[PDB]
């Protein structure tokens, strides 16, 4: 359906790079590279998407997770993106995300950042 | 290494059931069963956790995704949970989540729900 | 003091209209008109802003609330916008918002929408 | 009817103190004292609530803002709480909040925290 649509390389407004493969069973697998934060190189990501979306012009729901540990760095944090893929000439993934840091119980109240990223197939 | 800590069955305050295995490499895999919403039986989930957390009493960052499609129902949506695992006699996973529905462009502004779930090892 | 800066008429990407006065004490007062949702005409808003922001190029923190009741409609809901004002040739208010509906205890899990609006001084 | 219900002193799970008056026109006014963060003493708050709630056992929607500047400190930030007031023997205000810091454009991605507070009439 959108499996072909989704699979490939995406960029967000920060210059981060998202490389993903969409499986026929709804799986998402790939790597993420962040242009910001104390992140370097590629980090693993896994997620899911609606492999049988509605056919009424709705987007396709999806989400994925990155834990910010790889062989170079550990930020002791994880981001999840939740959003929808929108096909067409200017195909986009529109997301909102939550970034939770490991914290003490005392600092739990400020453990979580929220934002929005838009991914396109170019730049 | 909260690998043993994380792996197993969890319940949230809504009576939902989260069954997960934590891999040594930081993978999360399993199934989710929602006590509420347009949902029935088990749905696949995947995610990531920090397999080398800080040793200072901080929690362990983690997240995962469910796409609300299985052999019974398709809600045309996906939830991501972002949060942290806290060990100890009453181990908890404390989360915030985003639930995005596939929508038309005109309804995109109301595509996404936000909430918080707390998971424990009993009920 | 972005008091001058903030006061006036703003528009977001949905074609909604925000009219606000900033008081020297940090008050925000005005009316909001939503292009979308179960809304008509103007609704009162109130909020606060940092009336003595950092001088280092940072934006100015602010937020406001609208309850979606006026003489025409009642949507039994309230939105808060939280964001920052950024001055300059293309002045912006960048926001994230939570919209909570009054619900039964059984539907509380889906009480709240989350989004992002960007406001500019034209269109 | 919740004017009376809402008006008064409230405490959240962090030991913060929220003092509010609900006006008949849907206004909320008062002060907030945070038990955590870079905060001391009282800060002004303003907001709105649905003064004509549904009669079907639904909660009453409301929200309010605090800018974290007073005569003692300036944290260059603002929190909005969005949620609902639930009446009865153990009356609650159940909220989700966004805390936005003033930042440079380069740090704007990490400008906003998200959380949840529950307020009760005791402790």
How would you characterize this protein structure?
The structure is a homotetramer of 123-residue chains. The two termini of chain A are 25 Å apart. Chain A has 1 helix and 8 strands, in the order H-E-E-E-E-E-E-E-E. In chain A, strands 1-2-3-4-5-6-7-8 form an 8-stranded antiparallel beta barrel. Chain A has one helix at 3-6, and strands at residues 8-12, 17-22, 27-33, 43-49, 60-69, 74-86, 92-101, 112-120. The interface between B and C is medium-sized, with 12 and 13 residues. Chains A, B, C, D: Residues 4-123 form the Avidin-like domain. Chains A, B, C, D: Its main location: secreted. Chains A, B, C, D: Biotin binds at residues 32, 43, 81, 97, 109.
Principal-axes shape call of chain A = globular
Number of discrete helical segments of chain A: 1
* Pattern of helices and strands of chain A: HEEEEEEEE
- Helical content class of chain A: under 10%
Query: Going across the major beta sheet of chain A, what is the strand order?
Result: 1-2-3-4-5-6-7-8
In CATH, the homologous superfamily of chain A goes by the name Avidin-like
Radius of gyration of chain A: 15 Å
Structural class of chain A: mainly beta
Assembly type of the shown chains?
A: homotetramer
* CATH second-level architecture of chain A: Beta Barrel
Q: Largest interface by residue count?
A: A-B, 55 and 55 residues
CATH hierarchy, class of chain A? Mainly Beta
Percentage beta strand of chain A? over 45%
CATH names the topology of chain A as Lipocalin
**Biggest sheet architecture of chain A:** 8 strands, antiparallel, barrel
Count of domains of chain A: 1
How far apart are the termini of chain A? Answer: 25 Å
- According to DSSP, the number of beta strands of chain A is 8
Motif (Cell attachment site) (chains A, B, C, D): 48-50
Family (chains A, B, C, D): Belongs to the avidin/streptavidin family.
Subcellular location (chains A, B, C, D): Secreted
Main location (chains A, B, C, D): secreted
